[PDB]
Design a protein around this ligand. Structure first.
Ligand code: SF4
Ligand code: SF4
Lengths: 363, 363
């Protein structure tokens, strides 16, 4: 579900607006179903307003007068917190088409005219929310980004992969994107990389390796050739690599009592996935020498403030099943709360001492 | 799909009683029958036996006396027609354990003892049939062609393929098998092949191309380098490349009245598959100058003799949905009838004048 922030002065009548908007509920048998957007949750916002706006996907600023110290203040807050918004002129039965043009046009945001008492204009909110809601459109995995025509890309997988005659999706995607850019894609097992580099006669533009063959291959790849991992490529692809890389530095500042949350992007994690639940916590404890308060969070939606509040670092999974939107919604939430958020991929690369090299072609 | 069992024996042996007693073994929960461990089976009574034995998967020779001119003749026929068999001694209530050791051991085939009248030994036929039935196990797609360890394999796909971030299965399979043999797999679009060959600095062991980019790439690939197509690789993989290549020569001898059967290995071909139904017939008519009697056979299971009898050539599909066994059964049936059988892949390569080159690394 999407989280809508409801902002306005005490006099504007937020209660009447929220009740009239709930009258738009379109469910078949303050949360509700509002078309064309799916399920939504209205957040009433009664000095860090950061504690309420932390998981807001978009906001509504309800006005009935000329922009003042309140309007200017919450607009600056929406901009700072990366929250899209629109202005809803309430009580149009008293002031009407006065503030629509003469003011508020300068904010370059949608302006709607409503009357909660007269029951007018609430059938236009759903479409307006849908238009401002952050759609986190797919960004290239390695294509338009790091490739060009005639370049050699070396994709280095492990000695063991997926079922007979098949390949894992990050490998297929990396090959497809390379061919899309008309680059030559050289797929090679870790044992053939040294031979390939030394005899291929074309300088590789990029070498992409599996995170489990990285420590071996870093040695085989000359320093002048760009090298990354599929874990780092995934990190950038669906998350925020810059934030994940900056947030991993928090590992150094971890104290004994400090809370670390292993955050999962799904409720269907395989029992064979012990990298975040078992492996990373043990590596973190050995590296820091801190008896950390390791906690695990797993769900499809957004955590409540109480579940994440005093976390010193969030270590989110790769997000194999998650889209960019859902991953970015979590990133913006931790950015708003100023809580460091990293990846399994960024943590692995950091502790192995290959992060600086792996991010060099991307940053 | 069901298995066909040939029932052979002299007029004096009880073929009728044997067949009726064996049908007594029917194990269906709801002359054809369900015989465990094998699935559905069809018994063929054999009163040029080639016309009855044409689709026989295996055979049973029913005896009650010392091997004669009939036994020796039928055994030679099973060997010539590539039909596995076993001996069944009927009327054991009269002769018993006499012919089991003293004779028939020389044929090195399973020998069973039965009595159709006394109802004894028929519960052992199912397991015996199952043991002699041709399995037709998976043969390598290209792994056997690239002794790898260091060999460069160039996989050349087209400018257009499958959906975004994905690749078609013959491409993924060819890459997987290359990595299985620890080869260096270079995936490249047809526009980059000339550039790859000239700058890659390693001599390719094999170049595999799409059948739609073959006429262009034959020019780009030096004569000393082995080159094949995915169509030719599929032909060998699930069919008989030697028979398909020998049988394509029949195209030259095609007369005006001559019957050509376009044979499909599934009843659900996509409407976008006009290569065998529309394209090949038009190419065949232009090439030969013959007003051929083009017919289409589609299904799973063996065709009846009347449906294929006077066909001068069979042009079978690639069989994407079929297994090696079902295709090989069709190959053996046409070999027995001495009817030429070819592929869409072998026909395309032949008419485009690239067959000799494409089969050179395989034959
Ligand atoms: S990596 Fe995939 S399977 Fe594992 S917890 Fe994250 S979303 Fe679930
Ligand atoms: S190639 Fe595949 S889809 Fe086409 S007729 Fe043969 S089995 Fe059916």
């Amino acid at each position: 579900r999407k989280y809508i922030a409801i902002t306005g002065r005490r006099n504007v009548g937020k209660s009447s607006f929220m009740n009239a908007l709930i009258g738009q509920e379109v469910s078949i048998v303050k949360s509700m179903e509002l078309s064309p957007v799916g399920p939504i949750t209205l957040i009433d916002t009664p000095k860090k307003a950061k504690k309420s706006l932390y998981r807001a996907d978009c906001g509504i600023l309800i006005v009935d007068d000329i922009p003042g110290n309140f309007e200017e203040q919450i607009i600056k807050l929406f901009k700072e917190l990366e929250i899209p918004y629109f202005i809803a002129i309430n009580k149009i039965d008293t002031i009407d088409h006065e503030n629509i043009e003469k003011e508020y046009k300068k904010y370059n945001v949608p302006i709607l005219k409503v009357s909660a008492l007269k029951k007018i204009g609430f059938e236009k909110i759903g479409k307006t929310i849908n238009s401002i809601l952050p759609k986190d459109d797919e960004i290239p995995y390695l294509s338009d980004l790091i490739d060009g025509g005639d370049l050699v890309i070396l994709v280095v997988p492990i000695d063991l992969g997926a079922p007979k005659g098949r390949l894992i999706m990050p490998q297929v995607h990396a090959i497809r994107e390379g061919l899309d850019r008309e680059a030559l894609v050289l797929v090679v097992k870790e044992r053939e990389l040294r031979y390939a580099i030394e005899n291929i006669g074309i300088k590789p533009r990029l070498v992409v390796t599996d995170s489990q063959s990285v420590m071996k291959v870093v040695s085989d790849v000359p320093e002048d050739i760009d090298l990354t991992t599929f874990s780092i490529l995934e990190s950038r692809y669906r998350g925020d690599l810059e934030y994940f890389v900056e947030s991993v530095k928090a590992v150094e500042n971890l104290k004994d009592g400090d809370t670390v949350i292993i955050m999962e992007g799904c409720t269907h994690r395989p029992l064979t996935e012990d990298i975040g639940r078992v492996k990373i916590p043990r590596w973190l404890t050995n590296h820091t020498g801190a008896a950390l308060n390791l906690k695990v969070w797993a769900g499809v939606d957004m955590p409540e403030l109480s579940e994440i509040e005093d976390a010193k670092l969030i270590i989110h999974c790769g997000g194999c099943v998650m889209n960019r939107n859902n991953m970015m919604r979590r990133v913006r939430m931790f950015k708003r709360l100023n809580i460091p958020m990293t990846n399994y991929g960024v943590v692995i690369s950091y502790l192995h001492g290959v992060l600086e090299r792996a991010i060099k072609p991307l940053m």
